[PDB]
């Protein structure tokens, strides 16, 4: 993380912590531009300690008095009912063993199920042809070419390209 974008990680949560405490909507909305004037103290300057002392005093009065049980937007890392839908929980590929008269239903769905597998069954003449080439030695985050230079299939095929939908 860099020093300039360290301002941005605080700036969104500076106002996000405030609407936890408000009672109206305009009461929170009146303090948006009102807090903006403090942000408009040093508009554009150098990147040295003058920009760090604006953040070094943003240690206090940001963590100091921070969010007394705030809003959480319940579908989140925290919050209630964040992972509540777990009786279903999307068991993708639980459907290998059937021993049919249980595979009687959905006839066209299984006919398409084996169809997509040939896209995964034939990708390593193309994906592994660039997997040895795109990585220089052992370097950074290893996504492929996002078109794979002819046809990107996927590169992340198929557990990510057919990833779990929510309900």
């Amino acid at each position: 993380l860099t020093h300039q974008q360290k301002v941005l990680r605080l700036y969104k949560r500076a106002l996000r912590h405030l609407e936890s405490w408000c009672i109206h909507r305009d009461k929170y909305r009146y303090f948006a531009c009102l807090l903006r004037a403090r942000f408009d103290e040093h508009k554009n300057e150098k990147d040295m300690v003058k920009a760090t002392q604006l953040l070094r005093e943003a240690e206090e009065e940001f963590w100091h008095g921070q969010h007394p049980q705030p809003y959480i937007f319940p579908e989140s890392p925290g919050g209630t009912s964040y992972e509540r839908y777990e009786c279903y929980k999307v068991p993708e590929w639980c459907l290998d063993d059937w021993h049919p008269s249980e595979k009687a239903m959905y006839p066209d769905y299984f006919a398409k199920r084996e169809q997509w597998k040939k896209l995964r069954r034939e990708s390593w003449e193309r994906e592994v042809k660039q997997l040895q080439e795109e990585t220089p030695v052992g370097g950074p985050r290893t996504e492929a070419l996002p078109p794979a230079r002819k046809q990107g299939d996927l590169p992340p095929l198929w557990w990510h390209i057919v990833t779990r939908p929510r309900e």
Partner: protein, 165 residues
């Protein structure tokens, strides 16, 4: 007491399912956003929760704190139990003043729904029995003990005034 919150969590449960994901006292609005009936159901319950002026549990709540007149307590106990009668009463309006009073505010696609006679059968069956709870059972009972029957000046009903403030 068994009448009360099985109504109340279920009456508030229709409100949360109406929005389907916040379950916060934040972002609620006023009472009348096409919500006639369940707001009428809450104020039956919330006024009873203030400390029973003549509502559902009046023949049980009042005959005990006025049975604390003749006692042999710590005397810190009567200086601790009767104060919470106000603290019970301020629980009531807290959902009135924050979910039922102010301007309408919560996120959009307002998909409210209150039309299911399955739920209407449940609420109507309770409140008929809820209001006549302490007033039919205690109306016909063989007596067991001796009542107080003396509640003097400056010592008698001021816990109701504790609820008023």
């Amino acid at each position: 007491h068994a009448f009360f919150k099985a109504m109340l969590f279920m009456c508030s449960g229709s409100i949360i399912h109406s929005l389907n994901d916040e379950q916060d006292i934040r972002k609620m609005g006023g009472l009348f956003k096409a919500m006639p009936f369940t707001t009428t159901a809450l104020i039956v319950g919330s006024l009873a929760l203030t400390g029973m002026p003549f509502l559902t549990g009046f023949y049980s709540k009042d005959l005990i704190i006025e049975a604390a007149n003749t006692s042999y307590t710590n005397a810190w106990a009567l200086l601790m139990t009767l104060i919470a009668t106000s603290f019970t009463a301020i629980y009531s309006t807290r959902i009135i003043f924050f979910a039922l009073l102010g301007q309408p505010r919560f996120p959009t696609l307002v998909n409210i729904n209150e039309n299911n006679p399955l739920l209407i059968n449940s609420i109507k069956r309770l409140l008929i029995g809820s209001l006549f709870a302490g007033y039919i059972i205690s109306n016909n009972i063989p007596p067991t003990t001796i009542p107080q029957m003396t509640m003097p000046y400056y010592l008698k009903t001021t816990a109701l005034i504790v609820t008023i403030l």
